[PDB]
Design a protein around this ligand. Structure first.
Ligand SMILES: OC[C@H]1O[C@@H](O[C@H]2[C@H](O)[C@@H](O)[C@@H](O)O[C@@H]2CO)[C@H](O)[C@@H](O)[C@H]1O
Ligand SMILES: OC[C@H]1O[C@@H](O[C@H]2[C@H](O)[C@@H](O)[C@@H](O)O[C@@H]2CO)[C@H](O)[C@@H](O)[C@H]1O
Ligand SMILES: [Ca+2]
Ligand SMILES: [Ca+2]
Ligand SMILES: [Ca+2]
Ligand SMILES: [Ca+2]
Ligand SMILES: [Mn+2]
Ligand SMILES: [Mn+2]
Ligand SMILES: [Mn+2]
Ligand SMILES: [Mn+2]
Lengths: 232, 232, 232, 232
């Protein structure tokens, strides 16, 4: 049994376990702000530095993982609250798409909304070009921001949101539980074969994006993670 | 949204929010001890007092719930470490089976291991009459202790174990993530149509049993839970 | 090499290996509760019955030891969390001080905080009379509860704590590593010449104390220990 | 508080968290063999892939760490049981010294026995060129294999050895406890200023070496580690 686990209650620059890409910034209170409020088409991403082996070709086993994180999104004057945050899994060479337009691409896909990642988005802006539902929502993304599945959700400015994700290797089920500020929970599950959509070694992280008129504060507050792969 | 949420960091007798059935006893630190070490075929069950409505006949909706709790099993001299604990959901009128033989029935089924409940078992004893696997295991029980699905597990004496459970209403998926002492996680998931196996209002809880030659300490250390049913 | 070694995963009354002093009591799960919540100025101490020879005037050799154990301090309604636990080493004839006021004396010193022992304290209440730091702390005591050195620490109600202590005869260094619940470790070390502070044979144990208003659950969960004295 | 922790009960090739250098090999039982028995001047090293930040120039704080590991050394016919294993800490660009002669350099130093590392050696061959004591021994190495301090020790072929290391940032004390097969423990402590001997970012690992006539099996069986650096 090969297990990877870490726990972040706050973050600090210089920590060799976290990689910053784009407009990412660490505030004085240890929180991570993903986008820069003064940039058009801002994109910020934070990844756990070490790649995690989610499956072995030698045994054909896929890993199971449990992870929880909390974030906060807050409105700012004049700009439209957009675009959202996405928790993703991508190949180890993952980088911000060249000529990224930000916005509804959430910093992980091209203009068509395509890319190489699996993820869970917290979408706060309805992009008709990517078939977004008409309300804020949570969706499961498999190589595209045109979600494979979505559930109505509500983003509340300033509210701390808690998320718990469980990926069960056997059934290949990815389950998500979002605990809203007011106590109500939102859930969504989708069968995704990680061994067929991603390489043996991947990277986990968070990404957020904005546009010219759509900008908001995107904060990643804490993050704990554990993956366990059977080796037999 | 109809939401039911509670959080116990310790328990105390008298708390009208919990119902004690059988040999249940509360230790000095608020831990609940399920079985009595001096009784033969001991059975102890703790339940949340208020009934939770998991589904509606009018709308046809089913609730989603997120729950985590930590427990502990410890060995006792001269007795085989058995039988184990089960997180269960049953009708509001639920009671310990009449003339229960404890042992492999986990305090939720008859002699055959049949009953009207749904639960996740943490079985430390292999009962061939219930087609138990040859090792410690986690199992999804639907109206019987002859698990619908099981997964190899290892119960460590004196170790505090943490469990997270997410039930998604849309997919009808019950996902279990077990964090063992050493860090490793064990997962199991199964599709269970609650709407078909239980009445609209049910009760949640834990149960554990022992027999003549098989007994061990069974403690529940904490319990948080939140469910949300959509009313539309 | 004279070696003394033991390991208690649980404790049962009557085990001739353990001496109870004061308000000690064993729970049904095998944990030793050190204080009584119903008594004013409560004191309890648990000692390993067979005295251990830490040095010898014949050779001049001092022994080295390695020991680890786990405890749990939990808050109770209406009382201030006080006063903490201490792992101590004392003369073989040691007893709870006459007219023990409990409190900041931790059950091992007089009203002035003086005594004849060497120990590591997990202090959860600040006593200005004994020059206690303003926060919970781990300390190295040498014939006084007015610690020779302290280190900020943080006690978490309900959390299981793990400690490892190493005493090296050649440098005469006493080292401690506290593994908090969340995974962080706290350390503290100090040069304490054991052969100049205690008789050739001493007893090892734990002690806890309460006051009029400060009372809390103090549980010793497990203890393992090894000493080795070179006989040449 | 910045904490790094991992736990290895076995090892497997492909794990992106471990780096192999030299003649390292993973056996079927998950154990790591460091040297190749058919090569003259064999050298094998295994490092935890991610660099650990042991101190911050921003705050001037040093990290505290607790680590335990177990190894086994076994004789083989015809060859002299040599040369030993060394648990070391070195700069992130650490590699096997070019033109390494293996042997008493233990794979971390040049012919003069110099290098850039801090470590704990389990030396099974007396090299007079490096001022080795005449018996097997445990020593603390600071930039050289001519140990700063050593303690007599005995290597027992085939015996599983358990080691526990604690480094306390405040006193800058490095303490080692070696639990031999027969129960006896050996200890050694030395004050080493890590912030004055190493760069902010380092790597932890194990190295073993042999020579033409001196070869033996060197196995690393398990390894757990936790470091915590205060960030304030
Ligand atoms: O208003 C929020 C959305 O903005 C969209 O981009 C805008 C752009 O910000 C604005 O400068 C004007 O050009 O029109 C564009 C298209 O409507 C993003 O594409 C969308 O995702 C939100 O950020
Ligand atoms: O005998 C074990 C030690 O060997 C020393 O090197 C030897 C070499 O193996 C042997 O062939 C002899 O000819 O010459 C060398 C010098 O004695 C190593 O130097 C020492 O580290 C041990 O492994
Ligand atoms: Ca969108
Ligand atoms: Ca059974
Ligand atoms: Ca005090
Ligand atoms: Ca040598
Ligand atoms: Mn979307
Ligand atoms: Mn079973
Ligand atoms: Mn104190
Ligand atoms: Mn040496």
């Amino acid at each position: 049994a090969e297990t990877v686990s870490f726990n972040f209650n706050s973050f600090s620059e210089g920590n060799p376990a976290i990689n910053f890409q784009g407009d990412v910034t660490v505030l004085s209170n240890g929180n991570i702000q993903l986008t820069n409020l003064n940039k058009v088409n801002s994109v910020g991403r934070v990844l756990y530095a070490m790649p995690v082996r989610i499956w072995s070709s030698a045994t054909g086993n896929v890993a199971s993982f449990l992870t929880s994180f909390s974030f906060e999104m807050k409105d700012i004057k004049d700009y439209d609250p957009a675009d959202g945050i996405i928790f993703f899994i991508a190949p180890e060479d993952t980088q911000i798409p060249a000529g990224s337009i930000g916005g509804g691409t959430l910093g992980v896909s091209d203009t068509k909304g395509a890319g190489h990642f699996v993820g869970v988005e917290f979408d706060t802006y309805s992009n008709s070009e990517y078939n977004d539902p008409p309300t804020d929502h949570v969706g499961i993304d498999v190589n595209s921001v045109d979600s494979v599945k979505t559930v109505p959700w509500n983003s509340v400015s300033g509210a701390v949101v808690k998320v718990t994700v469980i990926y069960d290797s056997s059934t290949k089920t990815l389950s998500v539980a979002v605990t809203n500020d007011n106590g109500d929970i939102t859930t969504i599950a989708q069968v995704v074969d990680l061994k067929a959509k991603l390489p043996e070694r991947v990277k986990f992280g968070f990404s957020a994006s904005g546009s010219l008129g759509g900008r908001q504060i995107h904060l990643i507050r804490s993050w704990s993670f554990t993956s366990t792969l059977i080796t037999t």
